[PDB]
């Protein structure tokens, strides 16, 4: 029901619901985008497509892979304007950890502080609650790689295989059938399922120049964006 | 006041003494100068006594706030950064001379902190008034990667050199041994100084003092 | 900003506060929980099921310590819980900085409930959607309290918050007594959580914390697998 | 100095199951006395006292500020205050005036509210706690009070000999001081009762 | 529609109409295009004379932010003047804190986050402006950017802002802009303006061409087209 | 904005108050509290809410709050709003003692709260206090006293008062049976247990559903006696004995 101003601002409705935040859950879905993260091994893989509709539009200034710190990278879904302002806080408060505390921030600690900023916009009124979504990767020593995910509601969790954007319900259903026989994830088993999930949910079987791949691995812990040549190397490697 | 620290092959041994004076009069014969920070980090205090006490309790409260929010063991470099950033803000008005030591995942770490905010990572340090005497024992007899009882013998030797210098102690040499798993804390480790016996009769009589007015108030 | 500064809560003509009664509905539709005060300890238990087989279990915890002898659980919505947890951490240290002594569990609930009072009266903010259960064994006797989003608090022997709480309220009344052991209290705390659980209960579906006089302690899944190992 | 503006002497001493505290009575400016009934020992709950010495302004000021915080503590909690808890309370109050400090040195003496365990401590003018097992002293004539207590103190003493030891320690040391005297009041407390006595001292 | 009052409220399907309403206020303004060659950026603005009493150079839409940065605004002219003073003030603090010229990739981020902040609160409204940013350097080359009223900012090779946003970029993309010099670009910009509705149903107009690149040694200034008048001599020959 | 605000401050066209009359009616749908003067004492009585059999009651007092040293208060209304007023009121009575070193004389403590409780009906758009509460105490100037706080800020010094819509028939009973002049403690306790027999509809007056606290000026101490549940029992059976005399007339 529409009681008082529950359909307009962040107050409680009857039956304990509140609508101005669960309207932001499908504020992501106007992007026309889907992002997939897979953790299987001593590595971690982001994969996300680009959508270039214009030849006048550039190629290097389209990338949704964002480098927070040298060991932490992220991908953004949802609307573009709220996405880049969310990253400005993530770049800022990752450096305040290094200044105040003297060492590198864990990927688990950073996803708390980002979701706590999205808390107050739900708590306080007249403050628009940032309709975008963030997925993190990184390497923790003595803990392996991790994949986290933040919500506009302020809810976070960590989990192994991630979908976002428009097509979560079709991709997460594919990955539970994928991750039930926990086979040997060997840094190319991870990349192949990262492609073949998105290549069957969208069902495109696409050219080598429409996606990005972010990677981090226990050997070279720096965040690393793949080259169009070596993206093509993994793409023809699954042509069987 | 004489405090000292050392890093042996597995951990850190700290040492201190048990005298606080006011002017040139011994106020306390048993004072604790080794302060708790975390279950792996301890800190020895020197300088103004109330300045070191109120500083070492605040930062120990923040690390308990930090590690319980984080969910893992603290780092010695975190307590290093909190102390030198606080003491720089007061421009050296708070007189605190600290020896910071603990064992992290990365291993043992020993620091020395001056009241203006300058920090030094060193394998062995001395602070306090008798720090000149204790340092001469180190440089004569320090060697890298000592054993357990070899390092404990060096610190109790170095503290005792400051005790037989002026502003020494009523003599209860303290030790705090920090290792990778085992934690020790020894208040009466060495008592070299004893008080002599009283050879006189001082029989206080039951009624040898005149009383003007008495008053009785029961309780429950 | 402007500085609007007006509260979103006024009286009904009948005399009830409308938005506080709506916030209890979001509490009752949360994850179920149960807390039992035994003769030598306090037992907390909760219901932690993931929506998928993908979600890791070593990331987010339900039983959460405040001091080394005080824990705290909840039944409501997720992200509002972590606000007052971090609020109660900084509040409990301020008692220790003044008095050099760990805070008693009665004094902590005096101040946490005042924080939840402040979002009900002040301007433009909404009240909480999280009720709590606060535990601890201070000065011999253990304690078990419950605070609501209105700002009040109580003192229970055994209670249950979350979904199907009226069924667990009658079940704890028909099963609890004057005294038990702590090891007997966990047995009647899963059997009241098995009332409203799903078809499978493993070491990762439930999550249990205890309060001995030795301090606060939450249980690893090794004990919880060994505890539900055919002992009901 | 500023501490030597009004004089004073506060002594506490631990016995077997009991504890005693004593102070002087003289109030005055630098060389001129005013009165001989200046209170320097204040009750803070039963079986737990406090003594103050130093500048006579901060004696009456801190004893009212501490009473302000004690009554608010004993109403939020139904229990009484522990002797360790009061020492942390006073050290907080003195450290807030870190650079505007009060000119006094408190002495706390009392028993445990549950058991019979005595407790003595003293603080500096900025709040350094210092617990002992035999005696604590504070005031202008401090060095004379160390000379009497180091020679007369015995470990396990009945309330008879404990009164006679703290009497001879206060009379012989304050008579050596010039700006302290004009009467000595002695409080001796125990589990069952509280005894207050005044002594016959030199009135010069 | 209805809930479309504040900028801090969501629709039941998940978009903010107050941002949507301000976008098509830029649509009613006249066409301003931008293009870059291999060694420079060439601006161009179709600007119409109000009645007759305009004094030939008033209220221009080719601003000058920095030594090498200028704007090509379109929309509400008064709202663009206040926004141009932000970019003048932002580039001054980068000089005073770092000692060198502002990069255009960093300048467009600082402006777009400032435009983003007026799309979140109920006290203020979103801007009604869209504009261009062109610069040239020897270590970075030429860049060309694009900022909408929502705050999305990324790079193009060519663009148009106004009524004929689609009708201009149809014939921009049939140019070999990757290898031309920006002296040959100037005679090609003027025909793009004069094809699409210069004075057909309108009354009159006047062409303005801004200019930055290698020939100006990094300076930004208006063309010396007054000299030799070659833009109109070459574009008016395209009548048949 | 403007369309999101509550009124809380606007007169009626006839002149009455819109929100203040609402808060004075929610207190009537709450617990029951009363007091009674004596020649050498004063007492309070209270009604237990939530008498469910899985509670602890470890506070030794729920309705009564011993506030300074010689004063206490009952409470009625919103229990969540009530804790703000008590922590302030103990803090008003304690800064007075810092200022004069004399206890607060039991009237200007009440006016200090009644100015705070009033001020939310005036300036600032805020919710008023839905709490009325009693007062007991002793001073040098008048002695034993009762007072009656209101959400409006009005107070009155009563000899025997109670709560309204919950127990409004008690006020009609107190005018019939409270005799002026002699009102001593054993006469006042037996009068109080007679009143709660009718108002609380639970038969036989179970002792877990009541709460009684007293105050006697005793040898210069002014003790505040919250009497335990063991002597509530024989106080009920004394009133239960009075039925046997009440049936002799018929």
Print the SS3 string covering chain F: CCCCCCCCCCECCCCCECCHHHHHHHCCCCCCEEEEECCCCEEEEEECCCCCCCECCCCCCCCCEECCCCCEECCEECHHHHHHHHHHHHHHHHHHHHHHCCCCCCCHHHHHHHHHHHCCCCCCCCCCCCEECEEEECCCCCCCEEEECCCCCCCCCCCEECCCCCCHHHHHHHHHHCCCCCCCHHHHHHHHHHHHHHHCCCCCCCHHHEEEEEEECCCCCCEEEECCCHHHHHHHHHHHHHHHHHCCCC
CB contact under 8 A, A102 and B70: no
Buried-exposed string C124-137: b where 16+ CB fall within 10 A, e elsewhere: bbbbbbbbbbbbbb
CB contact under 8 A, A157 and C80: no
Indicate the length of chain B as a whole number.
220
Please, are residues E83 and E62 in contact by the beta-carbon 8 Å criterion?
A: no
Pairwise CA distance, residues C76 & A12, whole Å:
13
Cβ of residue A127 closer than 8 Å to a chain F Cβ: no
Pairwise CA distance, residues D3 & B217, whole Å:
34
- Phi (first) and psi of residue B158, to 5 degrees: -75, -35
Q: Please give, rounded to a whole number of angstroms, the shortest distance from the CA of F188 to a CA of chain C.
A: 32
Which one, of C223, C89, D155, C151, lies nearest residue B71 by Cα?
Answer: C89
Expressed in Å, this structure's resolution amounts to: 4.1
Strands B41-47 and B96-103: antiparallel
Which one, of A106, D26, F144, lies nearest residue B71 by Cα?
Answer: A106
Closest by Cβ to A56, choosing from E13, E14, E169: E169
Could you tell me which residues are beta bridge partners of residue C130? C76
Strands F134-137 and F145-148: antiparallel
- Domain harbouring C211, CATH code: 3.60.20.10
Q: Specify the DSSP element, H or E, that contains D20.
A: strand D19-24
Closest by Cβ to D130, choosing from B28, B205, B211: B28
Q: Is F186 exposed, middle or buried (0-12, 13-18, 19+ CB in 10 A)?
A: exposed
Q: How does DSSP assign chain B, residue by residue?
A: -EEEEEE-SS-EEEEE---EEETTEEEESS---EEE-SSSEEEEEEESHHHHHHHHHHHHHHHHHHHHHHTS---HHHHHHHHHHHHHHTTT-S-EEEEEEEE-SS-EEEEEE-TTS-EEE-SEEEEETTHHHHHHHHHHH--SS--HHHHHHHHHHHHHHHHTSSS--SS-EEEEEE-SS-EEEEEEEE----PPPP-S-----TT-S-EEEEEEEE--
Please, are residues C206 and C193 in contact by the beta-carbon 8 Å criterion?
A: yes
3-state SS of E11-38 is CCCCCCHHHHHHHCCCCCCCCEEEEEEC
CB contact under 8 A, F55 and C156: yes
Please, are residues A101 and A95 in contact by the beta-carbon 8 Å criterion?
A: no
Report the sign of the C-alpha dihedral through residues A77, A81, A86, A90, in that order.
Answer: positive
- Domain harbouring D17, CATH code: 3.60.20.10
Which one, of B98, B91, B18, B20, lies nearest residue B54 by Cα?
Answer: B98
Please, are residues A223 and A73 in contact by the beta-carbon 8 Å criterion?
A: yes
Please, are residues E231 and E186 in contact by the beta-carbon 8 Å criterion?
A: yes
Which one, of C21, C231, C48, C30, lies nearest residue C120 by Cα?
Answer: C21
Could you tell me which residues are beta bridge partners of residue B124? B6
Cα separation values, F52 from C28, C50, F48, F55, F80, Å:
20, 35, 10, 7, 20
Report the sign of the C-alpha dihedral through residues C47, C53, C54, C58, in that order.
Answer: positive
Q: Is B155 exposed, middle or buried (0-12, 13-18, 19+ CB in 10 A)?
A: buried
Pairwise CA distance, residues D40 & D128, whole Å:
21
Report the sign of the C-alpha dihedral through residues C112, C113, C116, C122, in that order.
Answer: negative
* Tokens 């001879």, residue located: D168
Q: Is E240 helix (H, G, I), strand (E, B) or coil?
A: coil
Pairwise CA distance, residues C79 & C58, whole Å:
17
For residue E178, count other CB atoms closer than 10 A to its CB: 9
Q: Specify the DSSP element, H or E, that contains D194.
A: strand D193-199
Task: List the beta strands (DSSP E) in D25-132.
Answer: 27-28, 33-35, 41-43, 48-51, 107-111, 118-122, 130-131
Could you tell me which residues are beta bridge partners of residue C229? none
Cα separation values, C25 from C8, C84, C117, Å:
18, 20, 18
Please, are residues F41 and F188 in contact by the beta-carbon 8 Å criterion?
A: yes
> Six-digit token pair at F238?
């004394």
Pairwise CA distance, residues F173 & F163, whole Å:
13
Q: CA-based angle B69:B72:B78, to the nearest 5?
A: 80
CB contact under 8 A, F125 and C5: yes
CATH code for E1-240? 3.60.20.10
Please, are residues A147 and A216 in contact by the beta-carbon 8 Å criterion?
A: no
Closest by Cβ to A102, choosing from B70, B80, B105: B80
Contacts for B95 with CB less than 8 Å, ≥ 6 apart: B47, B48, B51, B115
Pairwise CA distance, residues C50 & A172, whole Å:
14
Contacts for D17 with CB less than 8 Å, ≥ 6 apart: D116, D118, D190, D191
3-state SS of chain C is CCCCCCCCCCECCCCCEHHHHHHHHHHHCCCCEEEEECCCCEEEEEECCCCCCCECCCCCCCCEEEECCEEEEEEECCCCHHHHHHHHHHHHHHHHHHHCCCCCHHHHHHHHHHHHHHHHHCCCCCCCCEEEEEEEECCCCEEEEEECCCCCEEEECEEEECCCHHHHHHHHHCCCCCCCCHHHHHHHHHCCCCCCCCCCCCCCCEEEEEEECCEEEECCHHHHHHHCCCCC
Buried-exposed string E14-48: b where 16+ CB fall within 10 A, e elsewhere: bbbbbbeebeebbeebbbbbbbbbeebbbbbbbbe
Contacting partners of chain C (3+ CB pairs under 8 A)? A, B, D, E, F
> Six-digit token pair at C107?
């004094």
Task: List the beta strands (DSSP E) in chain A.
Answer: 34-38, 43-49, 65-67, 72-78, 132-140, 144-150, 156-158, 161-165, 211-217, 224-225
* Rg over CA atoms, chain E: 18
Catalytic site residue from B1, B2, B78, B126: B1
Buried-exposed string F55-75: b where 16+ CB fall within 10 A, e elsewhere: eeeeeeebbbbbbbbbbbbbb
Please, are residues D46 and F76 in contact by the beta-carbon 8 Å criterion?
A: no
Q: CA-based angle F133:F136:F142, to the nearest 5?
A: 130
* Rg over CA atoms, chain C: 18
Which one, of F45, F35, F37, F31, lies nearest residue F227 by Cα?
Answer: F45
Question: Which one-letter DSSP state was computed for residue E102?
Answer: P
Widest Cα–Cα separation across chain F = 72
User: Could you confirm whether B1 is annotated as catalytic?
Assistant: yes
Pairwise CA distance, residues B193 & B159, whole Å:
13
Report the sign of the C-alpha dihedral through residues E175, E178, E184, E190, in that order.
Answer: positive
* Tokens 């206490």, residue located: F72
Q: Specify the DSSP element, H or E, that contains D55.
A: none
Widest Cα–Cα separation across chain A = 60
Residue of B nearest to A106 (CA): B70
CB contact under 8 A, D68 and F60: no
Please, are residues E152 and E197 in contact by the beta-carbon 8 Å criterion?
A: no
> Six-digit token pair at F39?
């020649």
Residue D47: which region, alpha, beta or left (left: phi > 0; alpha: psi -120 to 50)? left
Query: Per the structure, how many domains does chain D have?
Result: 1
Q: Is D170 exposed, middle or buried (0-12, 13-18, 19+ CB in 10 A)?
A: buried
Best to test chain C binding among D88, D89, D128 (most C CBs inside 10 Å): D88
Cβ of residue B66 closer than 8 Å to a chain A Cβ: yes
Q: CA-based angle C69:C73:C78, to the nearest 5?
A: 140
Please, are residues B135 and B6 in contact by the beta-carbon 8 Å criterion?
A: no
Q: CA-based angle A22:A24:A26, to the nearest 5?
A: 90
Residue F178: which region, alpha, beta or left (left: phi > 0; alpha: psi -120 to 50)? beta
Please, are residues D81 and D73 in contact by the beta-carbon 8 Å criterion?
A: yes
Contacts for C142 with CB less than 8 Å, ≥ 6 apart: C37, C38, C40, C41, C42, C135, C136, C211, C213
> Six-digit token pair at C48?
């932690």
Q: In what order do the strands lie in the sheet with A144-150?
A: A65-67, A72-78, A132-140, A144-150, A156-158
CA dihedral E131, E136, E139, E144 (to 10 degrees): 30
Report the sign of the C-alpha dihedral through residues C60, C66, C68, C70, in that order.
Answer: negative
Pairwise CA distance, residues E6 & E121, whole Å:
8
Contacts for A235 with CB less than 8 Å, ≥ 6 apart: A195, A208
> Six-digit token pair at E171?
């014939």
Q: By a Cβ cutoff of 8 Å, what residues of chain B touch chain D?
A: 20, 22, 25, 27-28, 30-31, 49-50, 53-54, 93, 198, 202, 204-206, 208-219
Contacts for E10 with CB less than 8 Å, ≥ 6 apart: A20, A23, A24, A27, A131, E3, E16
Cα separation values, C210 from C143, C156, C219, D149, F147, Å:
12, 16, 8, 51, 47
> Six-digit token pair at F95?
């800064």
Q: Is E110 helix (H, G, I), strand (E, B) or coil?
A: helix
Between residues 89 and 148 of chain D, which touch chain C (CB distance below 8 Å)? Answer: 89, 92
> Six-digit token pair at E145?
């950017």
Q: CA-based angle E26:E29:E31, to the nearest 5?
A: 105
Q: Please give, rounded to a whole number of angstroms, the shortest distance from the CA of B56 to a CA of chain C.
A: 11
The domain of C225 spans 1-232
* Rg over CA atoms, chain B: 21
Pairwise CA distance, residues A180 & C34, whole Å:
32
3-state SS of B196-219 is CCCCCCCCCCCCCCCEEEEEEEEC
Contacts for A124 with CB less than 8 Å, ≥ 6 apart: A10, C124, C125
- Phi (first) and psi of residue B53, to 5 degrees: -70, -45
Q: How does DSSP assign E146-175, residue by residue?
A: EE-SS--EEEBSEEEESS-HHHHHHHHTTS
Contacts for A226 with CB less than 8 Å, ≥ 6 apart: A212, A213, A214, A215
Q: Is A90 exposed, middle or buried (0-12, 13-18, 19+ CB in 10 A)?
A: buried
Which one, of B128, B123, B118, lies nearest residue B138 by Cα?
Answer: B123
Query: Per the structure, how many domains does chain C have?
Result: 1
Q: Please give, rounded to a whole number of angstroms, the shortest distance from the CA of B28 to a CA of chain D.
A: 8
Pairwise CA distance, residues D188 & A40, whole Å:
75
Which one, of E10, E5, E61, lies nearest residue E31 by Cα?
Answer: E61
Residue of C nearest to E118 (CA): C1
Pairwise CA distance, residues E218 & E231, whole Å:
22
Q: Is D141 helix (H, G, I), strand (E, B) or coil?
A: coil
Pairwise CA distance, residues F73 & F58, whole Å:
19
Pairwise CA distance, residues C229 & C53, whole Å:
22
Pairwise CA distance, residues F65 & F224, whole Å:
11
Report the sign of the C-alpha dihedral through residues E118, E119, E121, E125, in that order.
Answer: positive
Residue B92: which region, alpha, beta or left (left: phi > 0; alpha: psi -120 to 50)? left
Contacting partners of chain A (3+ CB pairs under 8 A)? B, C, E, F
Closest by Cβ to B65, choosing from C65, C89, C100: C89
> Six-digit token pair at D195?
């005894």
Could you tell me which residues are beta bridge partners of residue D21? D12, D187
Pairwise CA distance, residues D2 & C213, whole Å:
50
Could you tell me which residues are beta bridge partners of residue F42? F37, F215
Q: Please give, rounded to a whole number of angstroms, the shortest distance from the CA of C161 to a CA of chain A.
A: 15
Please, are residues C138 and C82 in contact by the beta-carbon 8 Å criterion?
A: no
D and F: number of Cβ contacts within 8 A: 20
Contacting partners of chain B (3+ CB pairs under 8 A)? A, C, D
Closest by Cβ to B216, choosing from D132, D161, D195: D195
Please, are residues B110 and B155 in contact by the beta-carbon 8 Å criterion?
A: no
Cα separation values, E154 from A175, E72, E132, E204, Å:
34, 15, 11, 33
Please, are residues C66 and C88 in contact by the beta-carbon 8 Å criterion?
A: yes
């Amino acid at each position: 029901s529409s009681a008082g101003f529950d359909r307009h601002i962040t107050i409680f409705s009857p039956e304990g619901r509140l609508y101005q935040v669960e309207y932001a859950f499908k504020a992501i879905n106007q992007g026309g985008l889907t992002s997939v993260a897979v953790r299987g091994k001593d590595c971690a893989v982001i994969v996300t497509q680009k959508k270039v509709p214009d030849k006048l539009l550039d190629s290097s200034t389209v990338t949704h892979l964002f480098k927070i710190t040298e060991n932490i990278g992220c991908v953004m879904t949802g609307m573009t304007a709220d996405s880049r302002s969310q990253v400005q806080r993530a770049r800022y408060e990752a450096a305040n950890w290094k200044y105040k505390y003297g060492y590198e921030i864990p990927v688990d600690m950073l996803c708390k502080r980002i979701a706590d900023i999205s808390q107050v916009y739900t708590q306080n009124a007249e403050m628009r609650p940032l309709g975008c979504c963030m997925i993190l990767i990184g390497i923790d020593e003595e803990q392996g790689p991790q994949v986290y995910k933040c919500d506009p509601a302020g809810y976070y969790c960590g989990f192994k295989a991630t979908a976002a954007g428009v097509k979560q319900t079709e991709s997460t259903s594919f990955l539970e059938k994928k991750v039930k026989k926990k086979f040997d994830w060997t840094f190319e088993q991870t990349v192949e399922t990262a492609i073949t999930c998105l290549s069957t949910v969208l069902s495109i079987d696409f050219k080598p120049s429409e996606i990005e791949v972010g990677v981090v691995t226990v050997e070279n812990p720096k965040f690393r964006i793949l080259t169009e040549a070596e993206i093509d190397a993994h793409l023809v490697a699954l042509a069987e | 006041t004489t405090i000292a620290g050392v890093v042996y092959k597995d951990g850190i041994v700290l040492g201190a003494d048990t005298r606080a004076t006011e002017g040139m009069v011994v106020a306390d014969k048993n004072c604790s100068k080794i302060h708790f920070i975390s279950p792996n980090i301890y800190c020895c205090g020197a300088g103004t006594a109330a300045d070191t006490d109120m500083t070492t309790q605040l930062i120990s409260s923040n690390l308990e706030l930090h590690s319980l929010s984080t969910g893992r063991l603290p780092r010695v470099v975190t307590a290093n950064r909190m102390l030198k950033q606080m003491l720089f803000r007061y421009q050296g008005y708070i007189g605190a001379a600290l020896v910071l030591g603990g064992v992290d995942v990365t291993g043992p770490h020993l620091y020395s902190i001056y009241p203006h905010g300058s920090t030094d990572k060193l394998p062995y340090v001395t602070m306090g008034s008798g720090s000149l005497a204790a340092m001469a024992v180190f440089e004569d007899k320090f060697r890298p990667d000592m054993e357990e009882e070899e390092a404990k013998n060096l610190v109790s030797e170095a503290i005792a050199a400051g005790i037989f210098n002026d502003l020494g102690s009523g003599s209860n040499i303290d030790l705090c041994v920090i290792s990778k798993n085992k934690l020790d804390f020894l208040r009466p480790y060495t008592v070299p100084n004893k008080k002599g016996t009283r050879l006189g009769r001082y029989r206080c009589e039951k009624g040898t003092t005149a009383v003007l007015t008495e008053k009785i108030t029961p309780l429950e | 900003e402007r500085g609007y500064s007006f509260s979103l809560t006024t009286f009904s003509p009948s005399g009830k506060l409308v938005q506080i009664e709506y916030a209890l509905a979001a509490v009752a539709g949360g994850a179920p929980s149960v807390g039992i005060k035994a003769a030598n300890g306090v037992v907390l238990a909760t219901e932690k099921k993931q929506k998928s087989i993908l979600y890791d279990e070593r990331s987010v915890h339900k039983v959460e310590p405040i001091t080394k002898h005080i824990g705290l659980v909840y039944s409501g919505m997720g992200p509002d819980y972590r606000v007052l947890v971090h609020r109660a951490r900084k509040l409990a240290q301020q008692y220790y900085l003044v008095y050099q002594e760990p805070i008693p569990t009665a004094q902590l609930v005096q101040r946490v409930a005042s924080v939840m009072q402040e979002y009900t009266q002040s301007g433009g903010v909404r009240p909480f959607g999280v009720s709590l259960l606060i535990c601890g064994w201070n000065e011999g006797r253990p304690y078990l309290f419950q605070s609501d989003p209105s700002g009040a608090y109580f003192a229970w022997k055994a209670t249950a918050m979350g979904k199907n709480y009226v069924n667990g309220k009658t079940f704890l009344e028909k099963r609890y007594n004057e005294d038990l052991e702590l090891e007997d209290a966990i047995h009647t705390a899963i059997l009241t959580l098995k009332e409203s659980f799903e078809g499978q209960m493993t070491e990762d579906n439930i999550e249990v914390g205890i309060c001995n006089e030795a301090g606060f302690r939450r249980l690893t899944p090794t004990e919880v697998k060994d505890y539900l190992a055919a002992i009901a | 100095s500023i501490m030597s503006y009004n004089g004073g002497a506060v002594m506490a001493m631990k016995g077997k199951n009991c504890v005693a505290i004593a102070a002087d009575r003289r109030f005055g400016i630098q060389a001129q006395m005013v009165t001989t009934d200046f209170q320097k020992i204040f009750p803070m709950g039963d079986r737990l006292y406090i003594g103050l010495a130093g500048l006579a302004t901060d004696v009456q000021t801190v004893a009212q500020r501490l009473k302000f915080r004690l009554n608010l503590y004993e109403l939020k909690e139904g229990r009484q205050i522990k002797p360790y808890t009061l020492m942390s309370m006073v050290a907080n109050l003195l450290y807030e005036k870190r650079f505007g400090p009060y000119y006094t040195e408190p002495v706390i003496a009392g028993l445990d509210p549950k058991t019979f365990k005595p407790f003595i401590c003293s603080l500096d003018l900025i709040g350094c706690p210092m617990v002992t097992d035999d005696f604590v002293v504070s005031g202008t004539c401090a060095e004379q009070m160390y000379g009497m207590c180091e020679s007369l103190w015995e470990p396990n003493m009945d309330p008879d000999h404990l009164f006679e030891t703290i009497s001879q320690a206060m009379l012989n040391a304050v008579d050596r001081d010039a700006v302290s005297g004009m009467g000595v009041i002695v409080h001796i407390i125990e589990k069952d009762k509280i005894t207050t006595r005044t002594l016959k001292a030199r009135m010069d | 529609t209805g809930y479309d009052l504040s900028a801090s409220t969501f629709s039941p399907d998940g978009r903010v109409f107050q941002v949507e309403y301000a976008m098509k206020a830029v649509e009613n303004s006249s066409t301003a295009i931008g293009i870059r060659c291999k060694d420079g950026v060439v601006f161009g603005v179709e600007k119409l004379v109000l009645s007759k009493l305009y004094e030939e150079g008033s209220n221009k839409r080719l601003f000058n932010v920095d030594r090498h940065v200028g704007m090509a605004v379109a929309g509400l002219l008064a709202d663009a003047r206040s926004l141009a003073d932000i970019a003048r003030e932002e580039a001054s603090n980068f000089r005073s804190n770092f000692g060198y010229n502002i990069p255009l990739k960093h300048l467009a981020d600082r402006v777009a986050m400032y435009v983003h902040a007026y799309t979140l609160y109920s006290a203020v409204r979103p801007f009604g402006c869209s504009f261009m940013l062109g610069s040239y350097s020897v270590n970075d080359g030429a860049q060309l950017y694009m900022i909408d009223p929502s705050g999305v900012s990324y790079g193009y090779w060519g663009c148009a802002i106004g009524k004929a946003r689609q009708a201009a970029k149809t014939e921009i993309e049939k140019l070999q802009m990757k290898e031309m010099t920006c002296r040959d670009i100037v005679k090609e910009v003027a025909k793009i303006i004069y094809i699409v509705h210069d004075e057909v149903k309108d009354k009159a107009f006047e062409l303005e061409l801004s200019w930055v690149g290698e020939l100006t040694n990094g300076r930004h200034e208006i063309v010396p087209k007054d000299i030799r008048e070659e833009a109109e001599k070459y574009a008016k020959e395209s009548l048949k | 904005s403007r369309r999101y605000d509550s009124r809380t401050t606007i007169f009626s066209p006839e002149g009455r108050l819109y929100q203040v009359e609402y808060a004075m009616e929610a207190i009537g749908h709450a617990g029951t509290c009363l007091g009674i003067l004596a020649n050498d004492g004063v007492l309070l009585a209270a009604e237990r809410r939530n008498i469910h059999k899985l509670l602890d009651e470890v506070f030794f007092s729920e309705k009564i709050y011993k506030l300074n040293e010689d004063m206490a208060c009952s409470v009625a209304g919103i229990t969540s709003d009530a804790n703000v007023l008590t922590n302030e009121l103990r803090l008003i009575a304690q800064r007075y003692l810092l200022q004069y070193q004399e206890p607060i004389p039991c009237e200007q403590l009440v006016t200090a709260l009644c100015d705070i409780k009033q001020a939310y009906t005036q300036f600032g758009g805020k919710r008023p206090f839905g709490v009325s509460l009693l007062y007991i105490g002793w001073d040098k100037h008048y002695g034993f006293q009762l007072y009656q706080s209101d959400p409006s800020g009005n107070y009155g010094g009563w000899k025997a008062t109670c709560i309204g819509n919950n127990s409004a028939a008690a006020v009609s009973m107190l005018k019939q049976d409270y005799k002026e002049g002699e009102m001593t403690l054993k006469s006042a306790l037996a009068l109080a247990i007679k009143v709660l027999n009718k108002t609380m509809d639970v038969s036989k007056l179970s002792a877990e559903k009541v709460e009684i606290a007293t105050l006697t000026r005793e040898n210069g101490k002014t003790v505040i006696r919250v009497l335990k549940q063991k002597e509530v029992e024989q106080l009920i059976k004394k009133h239960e004995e009075e039925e046997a005399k009440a049936e002799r007339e018929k």
